[model samples]
Structures are given as C-alpha cells and as structure tokens.
Target: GSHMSTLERVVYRPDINQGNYLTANDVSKIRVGMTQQQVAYALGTPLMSDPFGTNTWFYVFRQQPGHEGVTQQTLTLTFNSSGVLTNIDNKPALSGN
Candidate 1:
C-alpha cells in the first residue's frame, strides 16, 4: 500500500504581491531631475533598493500560476550623484499566463 500525508504532498499556490502599480499617468508624473524623495512621493516606496548604494530603486509586481488573476510589472529608477532621477526603465506589459 502507498500512503502519503499532507506534508508529503506538494502544492503550489501563487500568492499576492505588493509593489507600486504605476500606470502611464503615474509614470508621467515622474520627470528627469526629480529628486528621489519626489519619486517616492509620486510612486510609493519601491520593492527593491540598491544594496551597494541608494541611487537605484526597483518596483516589481508579478502573479504566478494557480491564482485567481495575474499581473507582471517591472520598473527601475536610477539616480545620479546629485540624487536626481536620470533613468526610467519600464518593462513590457504583462501577458496572461
């Protein structure tokens, strides 16, 4: 006989995530030369931050399989030495999985 306990069975359920859901309009609020604080105010605190320095921040949100819905987003913000935002890298929109 083969028997497996609940602990022995593996199940995967995609969990909800938290990150700035920046839209076109939200992104539009950001402009070059904006201070880091300004960006944070425009968009909530990023999900990630530079480990070496505080010049870069990342906002990422995604939904894996086995969930009610899905979302995929990635954005990066880079600032210059003077703490002025200099780059805005936005990844492609999410495709249903």
Candidate 2:
C-alpha cells in the first residue's frame, strides 16, 4: 500500500463557496462616495466587518470549484465620517477581470 489513487479519486468535494458571493457586475459597479444603503444594496451585506465601528467592511470569498486550485477574492470598503464610501481596496477594480 505504498501509493494509490483510491482515496484521492473517491473523495467527493462539492463546490464549497464560503463568504459573500458578490458578482462581478455588482463589484465592478461599486463606486466611492456612495451611501451605505446603496453599497449594501449593490454588494449585499459584507461578510466581515467591525462590530464596534462601522468604518470598514470586508467582502472576502473563496470558492472551491472542485478543481486543482481555489479562487479567492478580497474586497474592502472604507466609509467616511459622513457614512459614505470613501475608498475601495483589493483586486476588485472596475476594469479587473
């Protein structure tokens, strides 16, 4: 029993997607200076955020497509004192693929 593909081949790995599943359209359209309500409506509730203060939000998602590698995404939203989106970080740029 040195080496065998039985275990690897038999194991079933359904596509397990974890965290907020923001679509490309929604993310690409996300703009700064938008109201918090507008941001929520466009991208849905953030997957991770600071409970103490609502200054930032994280929209990280990892997908296991039952393939060789997993696709992971990380997005950040910064809110100004006026409760409007001020900054957007991560690779979720508008022109990003």
Candidate 3:
C-alpha cells in the first residue's frame, strides 16, 4: 500500500452572529476626545486582551454552523493614550498579522 489514510472532510465555518455583538462601527464613530470607557461600552470587551494596558482590540465575526448562508466579517480597532479612535480595519488582511 503506497497511499495514505482517507481524510475526512471537516468543513470549518465562521460565527457570523458574533459580528453583531462587536461594534467596530460604533468604535469607528467615536471621536478624538471620547473617553476610553465609552469606547469599551460601545464595542464591549475584546475577545483576547489584558483588561489593563494600552493594547489593540480585535472583534472577530465568523460564520457559525448552520449560518453558512451569511458572510463572515472581522473588525479591528486601535486607541491611543488620549482615548481616540485610531483605526478601524479588516482583520487577518491587515498588518501585524
């Protein structure tokens, strides 16, 4: 036998509803003078990040099982010392990947 074992087809999917939970658009709507807490309130806490510190936050929206009909989306946000909306960009496609 010169062949490998048959591989199973495991179709992985994204959690699209997760997108609604994340408010990247709300964060983007923030202005330069808005407080950081306000930003947090608008977008909710990040999926993975220290609760304390200056860091970039990520909001990932994947198409979950049974939701394959919808599109998947990922949004990333960045803030500075003064609590300003720095950037709202596409995830996985941007730098620092």
The candidate maximizing TM-score is 2
Stretches > 4 Å off in candidate 2? 1-20, 48-53, 61-71, 91-97
In lDDT terms, how accurate is model 1? Answer: 0.58
Count of clashing residue pairs in every prediction: 0, 0, 7
Q: How close is candidate 2 to the true structure, as a TM-score?
A: 0.53
Worst 10 residues of 1 by lDDT: 1-10
CA error at residue 29 for candidate 3, angstroms: 6.2
Q: What is the TM-score of each candidate against the true structure?
A: 0.50, 0.53, 0.45
Runs of candidate 1 with Cα error greater than 4 angstroms are: 1-24, 48-53, 61-71, 92-97
Residue range with the least summed lDDT across 10 consecutive positions in model 3: 1-10
Top-scoring candidate (lDDT) = 2
Q: Is candidate 1 or candidate 3 better by lDDT?
A: 1
Mind giving the per-residue lDDT tens digits that candidate 1 earns over 1-97?
A: 1332223313543233322244445566777778888888887555454223587776544432424343445567788898888998766434431
The per-model lDDT (C-alpha) reads: 0.58, 0.59, 0.49
In model 3, what are the clashing residue pairs, if there are any? 14-62, 14-63, 14-64, 15-62, 15-63, 15-64, 16-62
Give the Å error, residue 27, model 2. Answer: 1.1
Residues 1-97, candidate 3: write the lDDT tens digits: 1333323223433333333355445546545454556666666655443423554666644333423343444566667766576665554422111
